[PDB]
Amino acid sequence: KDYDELLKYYELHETIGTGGFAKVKLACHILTGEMVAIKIMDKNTLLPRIKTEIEALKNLRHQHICQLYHVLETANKIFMVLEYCPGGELFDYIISQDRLSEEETRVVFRQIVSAVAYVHSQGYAHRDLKPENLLFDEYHKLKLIDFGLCAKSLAYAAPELIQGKGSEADVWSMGILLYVLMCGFLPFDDDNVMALYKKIMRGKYDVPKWLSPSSILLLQQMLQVDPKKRISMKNLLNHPWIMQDYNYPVEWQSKNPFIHLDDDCVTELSVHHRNNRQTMEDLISLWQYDHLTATYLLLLAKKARGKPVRLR
Ligand SMILES: Nc1ncnc2c1ncn2[C@@H]1O[C@H](COP(=O)(O)OP(=O)(O)NP(=O)(O)O)[C@@H](O)[C@H]1O
């Protein structure tokens, strides 16, 4: 019924995810054959957390940020078509490994820093950074996924954010996350909501015996309860610990920002549709996030993966 529309462009598969706001299905984009993940929201039962996520993602274009391809609103649904990340949540990857060496943690964490730092460079704060919100793509690289709370879980929430006293609070979070990567459990936890608050406000947590002193100092600079004493985003990029084994700062700028429309891609579409090239060109530049945008973008994903730009 609400599905009549989507079923035009995609073949639906199994639910691969459930959040509090959305059910998320593996689907295949019929025209290009590419796998995608679609986030399905009931407009009735919930709030405009959605308007935020979509406003955000249309403005964030980055190798570590999940790409948005297509929005469709129905009589009752909003459907969001995203880059499919077959790797699984980062949370799930810790669970199986127990915890990560510092070397692997660096590799991973530098990608979180890249994404978050680029997010801040655009004027936003994610505000809900945590492992369940970082997914591994087909290349095993991380993609950040969940932007309902982008601004222009309580265990990850900075003490000043708990207090209502945005960017520093992402550092805090990224600090809770680094802890989780290295030790494989939360720095602060408790069955009781307010007891867990107390813990977060005290900022005192276990320091496991496998952490290198560089690690432990890092944690201590990120996990400063007082925001004003917290490592700023700027020196996180080139901290000694961050640079170990790499010796350059984190590369946070977009390696693939929007410069020109793709030469080759405009062509496969005006060829497939039998449409004047120039009208095809002109209509892509509407950036509507309709099935036209989708097909275009998904054909760039073919290019970035080194696949032929072809339509079946
Ligand atoms: N791009 C994707 N590729 C593969 N799986 C995804 C993708 N986006 C979401 N999922 C899966 O489904 C879950 C729900 O997605 P998510 O955006 O977190 O849902 P949400 O309800 O809007 N927000 P939340 O309450 O914070 O979970 C995720 O944690 C993933 O496991």
Side-chain angles (χ1 to χ4, degrees):
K1 154 204 271 60
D2 298 296
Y3 291 85
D4 284 338
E5 189 81 15
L6 187 72
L7 272 158
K8 291 173 182 190
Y9 310 117
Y10 302 98
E11 315 213 309
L12 290 202
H13 305 318
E14 73 285 358
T15 290
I16 53 185
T18 312
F21 301 87
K23 51 202 143 139
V24 177
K25 301 239 170 98
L26 186 57
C28 148
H29 181 242
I30 295 164
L31 247 66
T32 63
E34 281 311 78
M35 292 322 266
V36 293
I38 307 186
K39 196 158 160 180
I40 310 165
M41 266 104 22
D42 205 32
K43 264 147 129 254
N44 316 121
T45 80
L46 78 181
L47 222 84
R49 171 178 223 283
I50 316 330
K51 185 164 131 70
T52 291
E53 188 160 11
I54 289 156
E55 280 0 310
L57 281 165
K58 283 183 180 175
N59 291 313
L60 315 156
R61 170 51 183 196
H62 196 271
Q63 61 287 16
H64 297 297
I65 286 151
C66 187
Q67 194 56 21
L68 177 58
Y69 305 136
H70 195 175
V71 186
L72 320 80
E73 164 148 25
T74 294
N76 300 297
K77 309 305 185 155
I78 296 135
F79 287 107
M80 270 161 78
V81 183
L82 311 157
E83 156 178 12
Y84 173 52
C85 286
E89 317 181 337
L90 171 71
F91 169 61
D92 296 312
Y93 179 60
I94 308 169
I95 270 178
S96 45
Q97 308 280 266
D98 214 14
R99 58 162 199 271
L100 302 195
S101 58
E102 295 199 1
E103 281 184 348
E104 201 168 350
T105 295
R106 192 165 283 113
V107 150
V108 162
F109 193 69
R110 277 196 149 240
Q111 303 169 58
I112 299 150
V113 189
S114 171
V116 188
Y118 166 76
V119 184
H120 300 175
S121 79
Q122 303 282 97
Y124 294 88
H126 188 288
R127 300 164 99 215
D128 187 40
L129 298 162
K130 60 176 184 193
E132 292 97 356
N133 280 350
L134 282 133
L135 311 183
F136 284 94
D137 77 19
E138 39 176 6
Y139 296 98
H140 208 73
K141 314 280 226 213
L142 281 196
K143 294 284 180 24
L144 179 58
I145 56 129
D146 180 3
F147 306 72
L149 294 184
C150 228
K152 238 266 141 84
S153 167
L154 218 274
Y156 302 73
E160 69 281 3
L161 210 97
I162 288 178
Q163 235 107 282
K165 272 194 267 167
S167 148
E168 282 73 353
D170 272 357
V171 179
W172 176 277
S173 284
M174 284 198 281
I176 304 292
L177 233 167
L178 181 66
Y179 184 95
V180 182
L181 294 183
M182 281 186 324
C183 309
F185 51 76
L186 274 174
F188 317 101
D189 203 2
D190 205 287
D191 305 316
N192 195 338
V193 217
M194 304 299 301
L196 160 64
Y197 263 55
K198 206 202 180 192
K199 303 184 151 147
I200 292 155
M201 304 308 160
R202 319 222 145 276
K204 287 325 310 293
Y205 46 81
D206 174 71
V207 183
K209 87 236 215 189
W210 47 75
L211 300 184
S212 78
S214 217
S215 296
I216 280 186
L217 168 69
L218 192 51
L219 290 152
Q220 175 187 317
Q221 322 177 255
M222 299 174 87
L223 296 179
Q224 283 303 303
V225 154
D226 181 354
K228 311 154 263 167
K229 315 209 233 332
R230 196 165 301 152
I231 187 172
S232 92
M233 186 60 71
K234 170 227 142 173
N235 315 285
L236 190 68
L237 295 168
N238 61 16
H239 189 275
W241 186 89
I242 266 291
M243 314 218 262
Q244 184 77 201
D245 291 316
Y246 286 70
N247 315 111
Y248 50 99
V250 171
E251 280 163 340
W252 59 266
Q253 304 195 103
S254 211
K255 270 159 171 49
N256 52 36
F258 294 132
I259 290 92
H260 66 93
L261 250 59
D262 188 60
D263 250 349
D264 309 349
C265 261
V266 173
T267 290
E268 173 68 35
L269 285 154
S270 75
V271 169
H272 186 251
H273 288 306
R274 259 202 225 84
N275 275 194
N276 169 243
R277 203 200 146 95
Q278 182 61 231
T279 315
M280 183 62 81
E281 201 166 313
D282 272 47
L283 304 153
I284 295 166
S285 307
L286 284 177
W287 283 98
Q288 271 171 219
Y289 279 104
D290 56 337
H291 183 243
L292 180 66
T293 317
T295 307
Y296 172 65
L297 282 186
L298 273 172
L299 282 162
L300 277 181
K302 275 179 137 61
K303 170 165 281 159
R305 154 146 31 103
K307 297 329 285 248
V309 170
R310 274 295 137 337
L311 270 159
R312 255 157 204 105

